[PDB]
Structure 1
Amino acid sequence: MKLKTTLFGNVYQFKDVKEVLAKANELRSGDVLAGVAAASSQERVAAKQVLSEMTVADIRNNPVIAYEDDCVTRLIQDDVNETAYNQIKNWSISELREYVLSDETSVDDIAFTRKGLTSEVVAAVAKICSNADLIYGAKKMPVIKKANTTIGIPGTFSARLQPNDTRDDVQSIAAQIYEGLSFGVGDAVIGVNPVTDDVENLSRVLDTIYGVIDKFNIPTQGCVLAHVTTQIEAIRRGAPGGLIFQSICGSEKGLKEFGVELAMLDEARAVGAEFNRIAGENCLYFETGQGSALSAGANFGADQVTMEARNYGLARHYDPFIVNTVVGFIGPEYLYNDRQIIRAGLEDHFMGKLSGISMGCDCCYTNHADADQNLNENLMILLATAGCNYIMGMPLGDDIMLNYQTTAFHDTATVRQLLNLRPSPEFERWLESMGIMANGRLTKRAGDPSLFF
């Protein structure tokens, strides 16, 4: 391979594949902080061309962290279909981009081809895509999973109901659930980040969620987003199991930062299969987001996009029901503004779909970043046209306890009625019987939690 190109008569040389992959990124505050970003637009473009010219082999054989050094690298590499890899290993990344985007490449074509990819190769493709490339490419790569709802079917759009409370007060939690359900939110999951990471508390929250599910016979699933170890404890001890959640990171060191062993995810699958109230075969929920590895000093000189792609590669091993990036969850140090957050969301979603996972996005931002609610509205609509599997919902997007702004319950109804998309078909049935939705639209009496009393 070449690590060198000339552009307008000036030679642009790079040290290694890693450097090329980093500098090819669109500018973000994260890559600058990590000190891996291009020096100018010229060198950004030169890196893109060098990358576009490397083969699948070139990139597959040069992972950011070495096989024998990193359990996540080993997981990713060990999961390759070597027959699919052998068909494409001599393709340039340029050629792989064009393949993904081609109207003559079908869903079934991509289904086999994607098995010959590693996360690094997935990343390389994302790096040479425009914003429209990322949206259109992602849209022609649907990924459908099933718990008690079916998510990911083209023409549909799901949503997590996020009824968080600063005190985990079951009244406040319930209040927001009735509100979200009235806007048709919750077909992805009813998921709470709890305050105490504690068996008694987890079951109490879970009991709260499932009290509403069981009372109205809602086709959905509940989740409490504490450490995977504590959710497993609670479910083993009798609490209702829906989805089992873990945050992940794309290196072994990253996982250690989070207190996560791979064997915990094995165990979560096993517990799911013994205990969980799930009809379909998918029951895991992962969450990701650009900058985690960097925060943990676990990026090993790699840009945050390449690292984020490694998360999806890890996730794919466990066939989760849903994954989402929490796109602007941390702050300006990794993603500074509107511009950069939109790009990252489009990148994250496209890479997730290319990796063949059930990829959603928490379109969100924080109050110390250069961002506002109009950003979340721009981004949610773009991602929806990309076939984004699901977004979040809270009352007006205000999390009273995680201290950021995500999408409103309003925003899911907006997206759905704007783009003629429907909920998960099972959930849509339930909304119709409750008189909340007719022909994909909120009825006159929707958006009113007192409807449930």
Structure 2
Amino acid sequence: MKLKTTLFGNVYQFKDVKEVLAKANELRSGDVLAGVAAASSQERVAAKQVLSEMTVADIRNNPVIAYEDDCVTRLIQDDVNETAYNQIKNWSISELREYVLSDETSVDDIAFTRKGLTSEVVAAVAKICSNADLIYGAKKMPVIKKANTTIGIPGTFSARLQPNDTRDDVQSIAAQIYEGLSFGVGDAVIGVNPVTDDVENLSRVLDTIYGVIDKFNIPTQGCVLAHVTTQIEAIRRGAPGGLIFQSICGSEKGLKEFGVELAMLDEARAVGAEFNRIAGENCLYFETGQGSALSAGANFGADQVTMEARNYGLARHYDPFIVNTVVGFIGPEYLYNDRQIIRAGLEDHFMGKLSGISMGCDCCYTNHADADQNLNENLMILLATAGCNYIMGMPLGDDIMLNYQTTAFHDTATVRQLLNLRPSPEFERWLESMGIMANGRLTKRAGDPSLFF
């Protein structure tokens, strides 16, 4: 280990791997808040070069929370293919970056190589990547899963129907579902964040979602995004199980903040296998995002990019159908503006794909962040070129109860027709038979929720 270079004659010294990981980040508001950011542009570049010259072994053997003290660290470390690790352990992070980006590196090459990574090493690669590096790197690392739809095939682009309501009103949820489907949204999942966290309400919202699914024989899956214990409860007691959701955090302390034990996610897998209406082998759904560990007190002096990578190492253990970052869900204190939210979105998606999870992005912002809808549209298109597995859909992107702006139903149809991308093949076939889609494109009759009536 060098923890040291000289830049324009000036010696830059850092204390540990954790500080080098933190200060190599592009400027964001969360790293300044965490106290972990570079003091200058020159120290940023010095941290980047130190990181680049550090080896895979250097980063692997210094996780940001230690093995003994953290079950997520344990889970990440114990999932390593040590044969894959031993092949690459004396690679520099510079060499690993160039390996990932190389056109002579195949999907099958990275398939084995990523098994020798930990999340800290995944983070380290992203930190010395430019924006086009993150986009091209992610594009050449497809991850494909299957529920009742197949997601993540190159040339395809999926979307979550997010039909949220302030009262969980079943007419208002159904209204937004019919609108979303008319734009070809919902092949990732039809997924409601409920107001109330109880079995009767969970089951009623699931009955509404699956009422629509069963009437029109839609190849998709439903989800209610309450706490994982309440989902399991509802499904055991006979509510239709589709995807099972949990928000996750990249430390044990962060999971405790969220009220999650790892054995709940074990249980969710087993409940999925017994109960859930899923043709394929993946039925889990996680959401993540930069800032959450820092909110929780639970980052332990580590930056939010490294902590967010540790989400993906956690998620990978459970082989979910879908994961998305919710990239600007929280506010300006972690990511301040357009530039920071785009960069985070590209980082999050690259790191997800490098970790080998089915990685999408809620391209989003809040009204107290320095941000508008043109940022969502910038980011969703960049990420779609990166082969982002899915985004969200809401009516014009206005969430009326989560109080933020995500992407429109329009935006998925736009991305698909702009970039010549198709839905999930199962869902596309359904859209064609409904008269909503022809040759990847919305028909004249599309965009009209009254088609279903």
Q: TM-score range by the shorter chain?
A: over 0.9
Measured after TM superposition, the shift of residue 353 of structure 1 is 0.1
Structure 1 segments (4+ residues) deviating >2 Å? none
Measured after TM superposition, the shift of residue 362 of structure 1 is 0.1
Partner SS for 1:422: coil
Measured after TM superposition, the shift of residue 425 of structure 1 is 0.1
Measured after TM superposition, the shift of residue 387 of structure 1 is 0.1
Paired with 1:161 and 1:32, the residues of 2 have a C-alpha distance of 35
Paired with 2:344 and 2:213, the residues of 1 have a C-alpha distance of 34
Measured after TM superposition, the shift of residue 8 of structure 1 is 0.2
Measured after TM superposition, the shift of residue 155 of structure 1 is 0.1
Paired with 2:18 and 2:165, the residues of 1 have a C-alpha distance of 42
Q: Does 1:360 align with 2:398?
A: no
Measured after TM superposition, the shift of residue 143 of structure 1 is 0.1
Measured after TM superposition, the shift of residue 445 of structure 1 is 0.3
Paired with 1:69 and 1:163, the residues of 2 have a C-alpha distance of 40
Paired with 1:310 and 1:256, the residues of 2 have a C-alpha distance of 15
What per-residue deviation string (whole Å, max 9, x for no partner) do you get for residues 403-435 of structure 1?
A: 000000000000000000000000000000000
Measured after TM superposition, the shift of residue 204 of structure 1 is 0.1
Q: Does 1:194 align with 2:194?
A: yes
Paired with 1:89 and 1:171, the residues of 2 have a C-alpha distance of 56
What per-residue deviation string (whole Å, max 9, x for no partner) do you get for residues 47-76 of structure 1?
A: 000000000000000000000000000000
2:16 maps to which residue?
16
Partner SS for 1:370: coil
Paired with 2:431 and 2:198, the residues of 1 have a C-alpha distance of 33
What per-residue deviation string (whole Å, max 9, x for no partner) do you get for residues 213-247 of structure 1?
A: 00000000000000000000000000000000000
1:50-449 matched pairs, under 5 angstroms: 50-449=50-449
Measured after TM superposition, the shift of residue 312 of structure 1 is 0.1
Measured after TM superposition, the shift of residue 384 of structure 1 is 0.1
Measured after TM superposition, the shift of residue 108 of structure 1 is 0.1
Measured after TM superposition, the shift of residue 36 of structure 1 is 0.1
Paired with 1:8 and 1:248, the residues of 2 have a C-alpha distance of 42
Measured after TM superposition, the shift of residue 111 of structure 1 is 0.1
What per-residue deviation string (whole Å, max 9, x for no partner) do you get for residues 296-318 of structure 1?
A: 00000000000000000000000
Unmatched 5+ stretches in structure 1: none
Paired with 2:434 and 2:377, the residues of 1 have a C-alpha distance of 28
Measured after TM superposition, the shift of residue 198 of structure 1 is 0.4
Partner SS for 1:407: coil
1:5 maps to which residue?
5
Superposed CA RMSD: 0.2
What per-residue deviation string (whole Å, max 9, x for no partner) do you get for residues 260-304 of structure 1?
A: 000000000000000000000000000000000000000000000
What per-residue deviation string (whole Å, max 9, x for no partner) do you get for residues 149-199 of structure 1?
A: 000000000000000000000000000000000000000000000000000
Paired with 2:106 and 2:299, the residues of 1 have a C-alpha distance of 34
Paired with 1:53 and 1:161, the residues of 2 have a C-alpha distance of 44
Paired with 2:443 and 2:123, the residues of 1 have a C-alpha distance of 43
TM-score (ref. length: structure 2):
1.00
What per-residue deviation string (whole Å, max 9, x for no partner) do you get for residues 18-45 of structure 1?
A: 0000000000000000000000000000
Partner SS for 1:305: helix
Unmatched 5+ stretches in structure 2: none
Partner SS for 1:64: coil
Paired with 1:17 and 1:127, the residues of 2 have a C-alpha distance of 13
Give the % identical residues: 100
Paired with 2:249 and 2:449, the residues of 1 have a C-alpha distance of 37
Paired with 2:55 and 2:363, the residues of 1 have a C-alpha distance of 33
Partner SS for 1:245: strand
Partner SS for 2:293: helix
Paired with 2:389 and 2:64, the residues of 1 have a C-alpha distance of 28
Measured after TM superposition, the shift of residue 346 of structure 1 is 0.1
Measured after TM superposition, the shift of residue 104 of structure 1 is 0.1
What per-residue deviation string (whole Å, max 9, x for no partner) do you get for residues 361-385 of structure 1?
A: 0000000000000000000000000
2:30 maps to which residue?
30
What per-residue deviation string (whole Å, max 9, x for no partner) do you get for residues 307-334 of structure 1?
A: 0000000000000000000000000000
Paired with 1:52 and 1:39, the residues of 2 have a C-alpha distance of 19
Paired with 2:201 and 2:111, the residues of 1 have a C-alpha distance of 42
Paired with 2:43 and 2:168, the residues of 1 have a C-alpha distance of 50
Name the count of aligned residue pairs.
453
Partner SS for 2:137: helix
